[PDB]
């Protein structure tokens, strides 16, 4: 007999063909991915604080510290700290999910763009891309998307697209700035830019 | 005959029958006639001792053990008298019985 600890589903006598097919089906994938995400979120979010050790402080430290100054404590209400911590959590997860993708879109017209950056004609890890296609045995998963594939083959040479400026490129993205410190940008530019 | 299809809980009788009338005739003769045997082991530890018990794994209890080995550098023989010993059948190369 076999029991899945993730899906909480039982099974018959332990056949490798059934157990292999169980770890491919979509319900086990959803339950396993959600369980790993929640356990990682719990071990990040668990603030294991140190146990405090307070000793009887010295006399001259008390005459020095109680005479210098008294600082002001800031504090906020419940909805304010809840909204601020929710914005900080979405900022932490969008920084953990993002990555710099300037070299992919900056060498887009390079003659070896179809041999390294296409990520399907790659030599060492291209067989891993060509192996598991997620073959979409549902007809709705193949009939949902109606856009182009734009699969760049390896055999694209330098004869195609000879002049990269006549074929309309994209203007590069500006360096993004922090929205909390966006009020200190120089409002006057150096040169006159139109449109 | 296959081992799994013989019977249930009667394999001990066949094991005793193989003990009485098989390759175990020398370990049986040494424990009933208290004769000393010489067991050569896989690390040159030759044991002269009397057999006290028999096991399926050839795990043997030995009494009045006189063991001897040889250090080769130069050539010396080092011996030791051990009263009680429980020897594993993994280490046993061979068992010789004297008449």
């Amino acid at each position: 007999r076999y029991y899945c600890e993730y899906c909480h589903s039982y099974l018959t006598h332990d056949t490798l063909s059934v157990r292999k097919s169980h770890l491919v089906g979509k319900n086990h994938l959803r339950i396993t991915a959600d369980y790993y995400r929640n356990k990682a979120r719990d071990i990040i979010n668990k603030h294991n604080h140190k146990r405090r050790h307070i000793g009887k402080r010295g006399r001259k430290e008390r005459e020095n510290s109680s005479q210098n100054e008294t600082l002001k404590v800031t504090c906020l209400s419940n909805k304010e700290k809840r909204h601020i911590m929710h914005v900080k959590k979405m900022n932490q997860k969008e920084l953990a999910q993002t990555s710099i993708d300037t070299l992919k879109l900056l060498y887009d017209g390079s003659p070896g763009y179809s041999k390294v950056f296409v990520d399907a004609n790659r030599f060492d890890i291209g067989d891993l891309v060509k192996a598991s296609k997620l073959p979409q045995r549902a007809n709705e998963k193949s009939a949902h998307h109606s856009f182009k594939q734009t699969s760049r083959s390896r055999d694209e040479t330098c004869e195609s697209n000879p002049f990269p400026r006549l074929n309309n490129p994209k203007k590069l993205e500006p360096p993004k700035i922090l929205s909390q410190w966006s009020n200190t940008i120089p409002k006057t530019s150096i040169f006159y830019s139109v449109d | 005959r296959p081992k799994h299809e013989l019977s249930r809980a009667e394999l001990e009788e066949l094991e005793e029958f193989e003990f009485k009338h098989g390759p175990m005739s020398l370990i049986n003769d040494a424990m009933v006639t208290r004769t000393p045997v010489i067991i050569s082991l896989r690390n040159n530890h030759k044991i002269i001792a009397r057999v006290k018990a028999f096991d399926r794994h050839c795990n043997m209890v030995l009494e009045n053990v006189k063991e001897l080995w040889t250090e080769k550098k130069n050539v010396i023989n080092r011996e030791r008298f051990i009263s009680k010993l429980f020897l594993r059948g993994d280490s046993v190369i061979v068992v010789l019985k004297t008449p």
């Binding site: - | 009680k84 993994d90 280490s91």
Partner: protein, 107 residues
């Protein structure tokens, strides 16, 4: 007719164990698995007169300061070469083989 049940009747017995690596282990027995995975306490172990692998295995167990004194060692079955029992114990009463007696009475 496995003689591991003979060692199961040998609790609180102060024995030595020579291993296949060459280490002599002096200590009292606490328990032994039927697969002969024996645990020992109040242990000192010594590699006699060499084998550098055995010297590494002797030192890298904590509590060296070549007699190494350790509090609790579990020993796997296939690493046991031989075990020496104390001579004061009576082998005629511990090898009664009550399971073999019940098997003979069941015949």
């Amino acid at each position: 007719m496995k003689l591991v049940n003979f060692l199961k009747k040998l609790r609180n017995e102060q024995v030595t164990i020579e291993l296949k690596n060459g280490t002599t282990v002096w200590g009292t027995l606490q328990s032994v698995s039927p697969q002969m995975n024996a645990i020992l306490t109040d242990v000192k172990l010594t590699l006699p007169q060499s084998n550098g692998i055995a010297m590494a295995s002797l030192y890298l167990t904590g509590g060296q300061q070549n007699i190494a004194s350790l509090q609790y060692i579990n020993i796997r079955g296939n690493t046991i070469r031989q075990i020496i029992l104390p001579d004061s114990l009576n082998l005629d009463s511990l090898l009664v083989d009550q399971k073999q007696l019940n098997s003979l009475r069941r015949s």
